[model samples]
Structure formats: structure tokens, C-alpha cells
Target: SATDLTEMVKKITTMNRGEFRQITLATGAGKTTELPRSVIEEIGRHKRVLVLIPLRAAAESVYQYMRQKHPSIAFNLRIGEMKEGDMATGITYASYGYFCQMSQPKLRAAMVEYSFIFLDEYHCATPEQLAIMGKIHRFSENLRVVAMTALKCEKRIRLSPKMPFIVTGLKRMAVTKDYHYDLLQAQRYGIEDGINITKSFREMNYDWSLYEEDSLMITQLEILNNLLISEELPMAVKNIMARTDHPEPIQLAYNSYETQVPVLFPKIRNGEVTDTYDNYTFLNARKLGDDVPPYVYATEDEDLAVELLGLDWPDPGNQGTVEAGRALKQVVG
Candidate 1:
């Protein structure tokens, strides 16, 4: 938990200025939970705290989570162009981009405002962002800075001039210290997990095959299971299954080998694809029950076909059409 780190931050508050600390928390080891605990404690003491995260979503998410837990504490989020309430009062959650875009005077004002500055996902910061952070650290003597990251790297230790006070999980690697995660173990875990996930995906696909295309019941089921499956393949399979009614047909529009005019069936119900007609070639076919004719016929009439489909040519000027088609496909797919 963050109790160790949270306590450490409280200790830093009592210590003299120009103090910097680093906390290395393992993934899934209460990094998110504890960091906020530290923030809340500082806020309880009426100390202004600044949380700098690399992404806008992370800033917003942490802000939301904290506000829900403790509505009494004054919390503000500054992500991209928007700021919640007043940043001058209470704790502020700001993105790296927001600070990086700030002028030196404005950035200095921020550094002076907050008693503690917490850098979340510190390693993910770009050089520009790092420069901004470095400047903030040197801006004042009273401001105590803490850098938090999930990754435990030697480079983080070696790069800094003075060693920062390190707060790390004793059980990070193992109870036995200095044990490294090597390639052989990675390969074994990778292959084993991959095989298990693949089997699970195949089983799900097999069971889903019974459901008819465009069935809302099946779509809801897919959505529910897709949220549950942590693995990539099953989630991808769920998406493909959900898109059966729309995108699978559009997939035929783009040929694997060459671009060609596609034969469009504006409306088809309970139609079975028998064979490719005339010069049109079948790229891929699927039967959508006894009703929808699901044959994609590639034609040689490119100009006429483009006119018929009202298709936008792939060009810089036609990006809006491309976006429109993509959004439409996502809505129905």
C-alpha cells in the first residue's frame, strides 16, 4: 500500500527544502491507491499539492477517483485546455503537456503555489517535459518533489547527480532481493499465456457461431464478455463478431491484392452467396443465416462503381469523408 510512501511524504514536509524523493512501486501493487492517499493526507494538512501526470486521461481519472472518495477535500484538474474550478486553491491535478506549454513566469508561479509536487509515471515524460519538471524542482527551496513510477530501473538512479531518498517495495521482485526477470522465464510465461488465451478465444467463437448476425442479444453478450476478457484475441474476436452486420461487408471494398470496383448490394435479405458472377471475384464470403446474401463481387467498372457508391477517393482533401465513413462504420460495426 501507499502507507510507506504516504508517511515518507509527511516526513518530507517536516524536513528542510531542496529535498527530492523517488518511489518505485510494482505494477498492481497499490501505486494508484497509495499515491492518492498521500495526496489526500497533504490536502488534510491544508498544504497545496500538485499532481503532474503524462496523459490527460490519467489526470482526469485520478481527479475523478479522488473527488468521489473524499468530497470534503478541494480538488481541481487541469488537463489540456480546461481547468476545474480554481487551481490556486486546494490540490491540482495537471498534465505534463499543460505545464510544458506554460511560460517560465507562469510555471514558476505554479511551483511557488504548491508545497509538494508529485510526478506520476515520471519515466514516461519526454525531454521537453523533463526540462520543465527539472526547472520546477530548482525554482524554489520550500517545494518538496516526489517522482513516482512503476518501473524500477538503474538508469533512473544513475542519471541523477545526487541519490534521491528511495522508497520501494521489499517484495518487488521477490522476498529474496536482486532477482531479475530474464528472457527464458519471459518466453515460458509468454507462450503459456498465449496458448491459454488462444484456446479461450476459439471456444468463445465456437459458442457464438450459433447466434444469428445482427442479433442484439448476441451483441450485448459479446459486449459483456469483451469487457471481461483481459486478453487481446478474445476482445478482438468480440469486436469482429459485433461488426459482422456492417464492417465485414465493407472489408470487401478494399482488395488484398489490388483496388477494384466492388459490386454493391444495397439491400439483401436471407440471400445465400452461391458463386462469383462474371468478371467479379469473391475475396471472402460469409453466410448471414438463410436471409442476407453476403457476396462481395469485385468489378472492372471503377468509374461507374465509384459514382454508384458515392465513394470518396483516398486523398488529403477527402479526409472528412474518410472520417465520416469510419465513424458511421464504428456506430453500426
Candidate 2:
């Protein structure tokens, strides 16, 4: 059954009185249009109101609707534009991100002038944002805040708990009922003989060398597609297979895993290589010799080593020493 909109409004008004309030409504529930009108009518009877949204699209939508609904009252959009002067009555819509950056003194002055503030999609508010709101709340005991969100229970519970409200159960005007679809059933009926490529790859020793003859990109995508198919893949391997590149897929997987391993070495400065085996100190290597011992040996270093190994000793300064030092520090650290 569809709930009475006025009744829902009354319930929220009562709830918002004590602490900050958060209400979770469903998508396409028309709460965006109804909530502001209800709040404005209830609070604006005695005081002015300000509305804050997170995006430009919402700011435009809410501003247009509020203007149409409350023609007599002055409604201003405060995004990408400053408040030209004092706004006496009605609502003004502003972006939350922009509002946060406004001079505190200026915003405080505006807060004192406005009576109530409405935060749309308030579920997205961070702890820092709520802290800012808390400061504004202090300016006027009469300043009322109304926040709206569709992610009611899961996301709203983390907000300040002082405000308590009822969940108005309204019949969704869009979807009739929630339906579940089974992926396994869909696959069985739609696509037969699903290629078990990943299984074949694992059986062949996690090597993509056999597929080198094919376009590296296609081969890599196939491997990635297969890896994503199974949830049982190791977390480390899963992250590697996530990359979209192909040329050397196994190298990508190996580097992803290697990076996670912590190195045992003190921090080095002045571009000196640390004791860490992975550290490739360029300046020190050049001073010692091009074939300096203890070069960080990793499959990822193959191209770099090939490029550097061919260079002759006393290789024209060429800034090679400085470049190598920086690259070594980055990889080692």
C-alpha cells in the first residue's frame, strides 16, 4: 500500500528535532521532490532554509523543482556562482564539495542568516563533512538539518545516532516486485559448451608461453576472463590477473605478487642502493662496473637490464647515473 506523504513528512519532522537525521528512501521513490517540499513547508513557515546536494545534476533538478513548487519564495542555485547578496526567503541549492571549500567566515555568516539546511544524499557524507556540519549546527539552535539517502540501513547507521526516524514503506511506482535471476541457469540455457580455458591453462603449468603465437592482447584477455570466472583464485593471483595488458601476462602476475613482499633494509638517501636484494642502485653500480654484482634479479628487470647491459663503461655521463639512481630508489623503497 502507498503511504500518505504527509504522514511520512510528520514522522521525519519529529525525528529531526533531537540530533542530525538520516532517512533512506529507495531510488526513484520521489523522495527528492517530496522531502524538500515537506521540510520547507514545515520549517520555512517560521525560518529560511538552505539545501545542499553532492552533484551539479542534482543541484539543477532540485532547484528547478523547488522553484516551481514555491514560486513566491526566492530560490537560488549556489553552485559555480556566489550568493550575490542576502537571500531572505525560500531555498538555495549548493554543492556539498564546493560548500566545504567556501571561506569558513563567509559560510558561518550565511549559516547564521539561513534557518535550516537540507543535505541531499547525506549517506555520502564523510566524517569530516559531518564535523563541518556540527560547527554550523552550533551557530543557530533553530538551524535544522534534514538529510536524505536511499541506502537506509546499511549506510546510515554509521552516522550520528541521536536522530531516529521511521522508515516509510511506500509502494514503488516503478518495479512491481524484486526478482532474482540465476546466472548458472542463464548460462546453461543461453550458451552451451562454455570454454574452460582457465582450467586448461592451470593444467599446463600457469604458463602463457604456449599462446605466444597468438595476438598477445587476445591471449591475455582470455586468461583474464578465465581467472575472473573462478572465486577460488588466490587473492594475490586474482589482483595480477585483473590488469588488462597481455604482452607478458605471467610477468604481470609475478610483479604483482613480488611487490607485496616486505623488504628488509634501512632507508637509503643520497641515491645509494640499500642492502635490499631488489634495490638497483645506479650511481654505485656505475662506479663499481656495468656488471656490478647483486643486480636485483626479477623478470620485470629484464628489459631494463638488457638496455643498460649493452652500454659501454665510462658511458658518456648521459644522465644515466642519475636516472638509474632514481629508478632504483623507487623500486627498492
Candidate 3:
């Protein structure tokens, strides 16, 4: 049934501008595979297109796929470190965080070029993200908006009631499926190299202090990983090895004189960690943003996702206004 997206991408052009469509597919569905295709389709029919993804890795995956699949089409990845007139390509792939960091004037100047806007992982839309979309819609009603999500939402149609979505299947364990395969790839690389290295998030830096609260428990392995990846890895590892807050993983790493250390990831069931990682359940997956409990709930009914569009958009005004929003600003600004 995931193949349904293949046909949908082919037929998406039949839909006109000024229309909003929500594509609600089951987990493991190939909705992401068709992202570039849908962008290409829109570009041929209209002007350029903007594809907004929630994760930087997801944006890069799509960017790479678009390049390999269609060499002729110019696709630009807008995660960090950009030049002037960088988005002149046929399609621009950007993370939700990076896109929201743009000033109101910058957004007004930049977003007006794209005739189509596609939001992947649409359920993860933060307040400022929603506000940004609202601003774009206000700029021109003629812009076509497409939102896709494998994750079910309390409300199907976010931002606007008029924009409705279509659901294809039932909810399943597929939501936990790792769409960002690159993270695993990095993990595999470290394992094969016999180095206890963690994946790098060179651009997506988060304040570890924000996560220091006892209520928000992180894995000892994750803590060690964070220390290793920090800007001052040597100093951090040296400083934290003796601290009580550092935990066993740091001491283990220190004793080994190597990154090699055994780590047991927590076992999750029904969104709760039945087993602990060093007596700590790694519930908070994203270190940067709000706490997303390792819980999964979904509704197949598309109508439930519909709501009256709020007239007032709760924009953060500037980039660094919110804590999570502040991390996103660090990359672009």
C-alpha cells in the first residue's frame, strides 16, 4: 500500500495551486521517496518548490536522493552556511529549524519565490513553524501547500481547516522505523572501526545544561556520547570522568583509554521503557527540542485531524526567543 505514493506523485499535478493537501500514510510507507518527485512535478507545472523537513538528516537524505535520481534538476540543501542566491535552484531542501530561524523580513524576501511548499513530518510543526507557514499563506493564497506525515496527529489539518488530508492505512509499529538511516550508518561505522564514537551533529548543537534536570533522564551512553561530540571533547572527557554527574559510562571510557565501551540501549514497549539503560530510560529522544516521550498514538480518521484555523499565528518574533528555537538559530545566524 506504500506504493500508493508512487501513483500519487504521478497524479499530483492534477491538483491546482491555492489548494492544500495532507498525505497521511502508514509507517514505513514510501512517502519520503516521492518527496523529490512531488517537488519536481510542482516545478514543471509551476515555479520553484520548497521542501521543509523536520530533521537535518532527513533533508540531506532527500537532497542526495534527488541528486542521484534526477541529475538535471537543481536541488539545494539549506541546513547551514549559505551563500547569497543559494536557493535559485529548482528545489530547496531545508530543515524546519533552519527555515524558522529566518527573520520576518528574510522570510518575506526568500519564501515568495516558491510556488509550492511541502512539509514532511508535518505533525512535528512547532508554534513558530506554524506561524511561518501562516505568514507564507498570508503573503499569497495562490501558493500550493502539501503536508505529509506517517505519524498520526490529534488534529489532521493543522494551521488551516480548509486544508484537509487523506489517510491511507492503519497505525502500526512502523512509526518507530528509522527513516533517517544515516544515523545508523554512522553508528555502524564507529562499531566497525572499534571506536566508541558517536554520530556527529556538527551544526545541530544543543545546550546540555537544559537537559540536566533529574526529571529528564538520559542514558549514560548518551551522556558519554554527548561529551565525546562536544566542542571540547578532550577537556569534557577529562573533566567529566571524575564527576558524579558523569556516571559509569564516562569512567568506563576513561579506564579503557579508548572510546570502546559496552552500552545497552533501553527496551521500549507501548512508548514506555520497560527496561532501563543504566537504570535510566532514554525517553527524551531529541536533545534540542521539547521532551517527546517515547510514546506512539494515532488515529486513522482524517477528520479528527481537522480544526478551525487560528487567526493569530503565535510567532516567536525573532529566532532566539524560544529555547528549542534558539538552537536552530545557532546554525544559520
TM-score of each: 0.41, 0.39, 0.41
lDDT, candidate 3, 71-171, per-residue tens: 76777788876445545657788875565555545665676677667767755534334334444554434556776777442222111111111112233
The lDDT of each candidate is 0.43, 0.41, 0.43
Candidate 2 root-mean-square deviation in Å: 22.6
Each model's backbone clash number: 5, 0, 3
Candidate 2 structure quality by residue, lDDT tens digits, 181-214: 1111111111112323223322221221211222
Cα displacement (Å) at residue 68, model 3: 2.4
Kindly indicate the candidate among 1 and 2 with the higher TM-score. Answer: 1
* Candidate 3, superposed: residue stretches over 4 Å from native: 1-7, 27-29, 38-47, 151-333
Instruction: Give the Cα error of residue 10 in candidate 3, in Å.
Output: 6.2
Model 1, span 1-333: residue lDDT tens:
446765755765564456666667775544544565565576464667787887788889988987797677778788767342344655678876676555555666667667777777765534334444544644546566766777333211000111111111112222211211111111111121222222222242243231123333223222222222223333333343335443232223212112222333333223332223222224233322222221111222222233344543232123332343343334445
| Residue 246 displacement (Å), model 3 | 20
Q: In model 3, what are the clashing residue pairs, if there are any?
A: 155-305, 156-305, 157-305
